Design a protein around this ligand. Sequence first.
Ligand SMILES: CCCCCCCCCCCCCCCC(=O)O[C@H](COC(=O)CCCCCCCC[C@H](C)CCCCCCCC)COP(=O)(O)O
Ligand SMILES: CCCCCCCCCCCCCCCC(=O)O[C@H](COC(=O)CCCCCCCC[C@H](C)CCCCCCCC)COP(=O)(O)O
Ligand SMILES: C=C/C(C)=C/[C@@]1(C)SC(=O)C(C(=O)C(F)(F)F)=C1O
Ligand SMILES: C=C/C(C)=C/[C@@]1(C)SC(=O)C(C(=O)C(F)(F)F)=C1O
Ligand SMILES: [K+]
Ligand SMILES: [K+]
Lengths: 414, 414
Amino acid sequence: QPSTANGGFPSVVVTAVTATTSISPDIESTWKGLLAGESGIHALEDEFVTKWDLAVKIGGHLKDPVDSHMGRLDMRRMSYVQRMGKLLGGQLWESAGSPEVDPDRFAVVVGTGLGGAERIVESYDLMNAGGPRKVSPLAVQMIMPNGAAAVIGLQLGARAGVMTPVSAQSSGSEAIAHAWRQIVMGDADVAVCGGVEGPIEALPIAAFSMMRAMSTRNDEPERASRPFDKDRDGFVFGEAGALMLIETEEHAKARGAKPLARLLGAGITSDAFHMVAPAADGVRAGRAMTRSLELAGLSPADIDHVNAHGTATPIGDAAEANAIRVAGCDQAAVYAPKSALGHSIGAVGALESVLTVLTLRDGVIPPTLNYETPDPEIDLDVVAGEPRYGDYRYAVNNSFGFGGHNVALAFGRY
Amino acid sequence: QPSTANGGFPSVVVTAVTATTSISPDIESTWKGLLAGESGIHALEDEFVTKWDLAVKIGGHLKDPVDSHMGRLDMRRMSYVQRMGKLLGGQLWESAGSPEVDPDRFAVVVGTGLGGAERIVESYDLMNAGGPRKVSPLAVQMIMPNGAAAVIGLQLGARAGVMTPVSAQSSGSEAIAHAWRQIVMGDADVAVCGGVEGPIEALPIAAFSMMRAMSTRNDEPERASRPFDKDRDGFVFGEAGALMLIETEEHAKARGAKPLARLLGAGITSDAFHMVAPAADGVRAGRAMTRSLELAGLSPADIDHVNAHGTATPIGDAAEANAIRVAGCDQAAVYAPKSALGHSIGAVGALESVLTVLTLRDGVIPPTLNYETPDPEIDLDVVAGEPRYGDYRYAVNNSFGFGGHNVALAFGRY
Ligand SMILES: CCCCCCCCCCCCCCCC(=O)O[C@H](COC(=O)CCCCCCCC[C@H](C)CCCCCCCC)COP(=O)(O)O
Ligand SMILES: CCCCCCCCCCCCCCCC(=O)O[C@H](COC(=O)CCCCCCCC[C@H](C)CCCCCCCC)COP(=O)(O)O
Ligand SMILES: C=C/C(C)=C/[C@@]1(C)SC(=O)C(C(=O)C(F)(F)F)=C1O
Ligand SMILES: C=C/C(C)=C/[C@@]1(C)SC(=O)C(C(=O)C(F)(F)F)=C1O
Ligand SMILES: [K+]
Ligand SMILES: [K+]
């Protein structure tokens, strides 16, 4: 029975990470902010909020907007998730030391929730106003949801496959799972993986608001996202994109890269319960966690830390507490980063996987913000108030998505 | 190292297929039609053609529209690709004998090019006319590109993962590739897999036309799609969707399912060349074919048949001919079904995978339509004029996608 622990799968390490967030464009600065209790969530100052008088008037825009780094041709030839992909792909490579790798052993797996959807609406308006010849010859390649992964693949020269798993809010973690499978199956030795997502805009706010999923605590934006708290009232948008570089331990050693963590195993399951509510019992979600432990070669008692999906809906957080119990991981120290960074949909599982790596690298879990009144249906060890220090040696990052998708990633200290 | 031939992977069999096409809603009648030299391509009668005076006036709508099978509630609460996926998933399951399987060992993998995009422009229009509270509460779950796979997962009860790989025109084959991986890695014993795609409409025609990729042979619609022909001048749309049921041979035998064929291995690579032109040398595309043979345990000398992606662009077919040579597969009999069925984008690799399976089951390849003047740069054995009967044992199905994606599937006669 192959596991990582028993040498049945090659050892896979994380050797570089990059992310842009509502706190900082610099992941090390985001991480210092989080440990200091900073939130990226503010009053939205966009004119679209007053134009439409939106019920939701809070969110975290990126600290450093993607397009301040894009030249004239990038703005007219890529959709926004493609520009974010290019920006992060170059940062990651530079952070990695700009390695010269074998392109034929180099894969890219990048998830996103939707793709270049603004170009859909642009092409629709252009054609309605001026006919079919007003549609750009670039529209197809900007719009297609594999667009961002493909821009990264072209940019960095990856020829062992470029893949885009889409599973709504779990896409960013699912991508890192498929990258790990591609390596252990022997299709690649090195992979860039993670997730990108669009910015906060009026139409996405309108659509999730009609699901009654979003916090409307507009008077205290930094207090609004309260995962696992008794007084939680839904999620808050917080923009992000994140990528990491993973490679076999052999490949990293040959080029002198210092690992940040190990990526030990991944589990994907599905609920077959409901399209937009997680099964309350957490059973299939718990089993995604268990399967990541089986592939890693770990037991539940090994898991020191869980990085919760923790969206701060009443229903979502209760199902996830039940899933953590099913997996036997409810004595782990838990963090819910959406408390501070909000929800970035297709990117967020990637961002939170990067945070999980940093917890293992640095031996610390940031405080979950706004965690003030424990909820008795949630009987979890939620880290709050101040950071929790410790010699953490194994952690699980959870992500789930509309459609019933459950993804868990098992990481270890290097 | 593990292969199907050496027993390192479990044996995986195809036990049911379903597809709706421009020739027939019934895959067995599609197949009889193809063998009789029928084309599904006609003059488009839609009012949108004359409204916009589109340069392209030809293509193949489904013989039997998806929505002649849909209630008005489904029409309001699913996107088109979800409706297609629900229709096909129920037909497939019925064809399989409505098996009772273990939901926790049952996965769904279904690709699509874009997703529920008509609900994006609908939501946009609604909000522009009446504000954010006019957007449907179901809009997110109809729009998300994992929506179709998730509908099928919920309909059929799949709890071992629901996955949507997006790779533009290769998505449908890539979905069968990941379903095969999901079974051989031990995450599932049974999977529903394939591709769905939306119908021909004005804005998709405008966007692909503006790339100068489409045939405009409007006076002779059935003669327009000419893969590998010297006078080819671009692709023709032909609607489709297709799913197959795959399962371990053990699982099939246990429920008394007769296999249609064996699914032996899958190879996925990428070009890192250009976003919308394939690499002219065919090298990475050929290595996708080679990887599928490695995993099957086959050599190129074993291959009897290649089902070509064969879009009928000048550069596309030339690059694929080079690919087949790189893989050592250029002595095989080649069929290009887009000649008769046209291009259905995210569904097409699934449709052509089902055709490959029927070639192997029945020992016959349909004629490539319109193949009249051999092109010296192609130098392939293109089956043409009449169906070719033979004792086919091993076949490769090729699909490629914008972004530089290459997918090959190796199938065997059962
Ligand atoms: C991280 C939190 C946010 C997550 C939100 C994720 C939602 C999906 C991502 C959508 C991508 C949007 C990209 C925006 C690019 C941009 O900025 O376009 C502005 C101007 O506005 C626009 O064009 C808005 C056009 C809207 C595009 C259609 C969005 C449809 C959303 C659906 C109705 C609801 C969400 C579906 C989500 C499904 C997947 C996840 C479950 C440039 O402005 P200017 O320079 O022209 O002045
Ligand atoms: C097989 C060939 C086709 C392949 C085409 C693939 C393109 C993707 C298809 C997307 C889904 C289309 C579903 C249409 C639903 C339908 O039928 O709605 C009509 C009324 O028109 C409409 O609303 C058209 C709505 C337009 C939707 C936006 C399409 C944007 C397309 C992009 C600009 C260009 C294509 C990008 C593809 C990228 C991915 C693949 C590389 C019935 O009207 P009614 O009488 O029922 O009221
Ligand atoms: C099957 C539905 C699932 C997994 C829904 C979850 C918990 S996953 C997710 O991100 C999410 C949210 O965004 C929401 F709606 F705010 F809670 C959810 O409601
Ligand atoms: C990287 C670009 C690729 C693989 C383009 C291909 C050959 S894949 C594909 O389906 C396709 C077409 O549909 C087109 F445009 F008709 F030729 C192509 O142009
Ligand atoms: K998480
Ligand atoms: K093919």
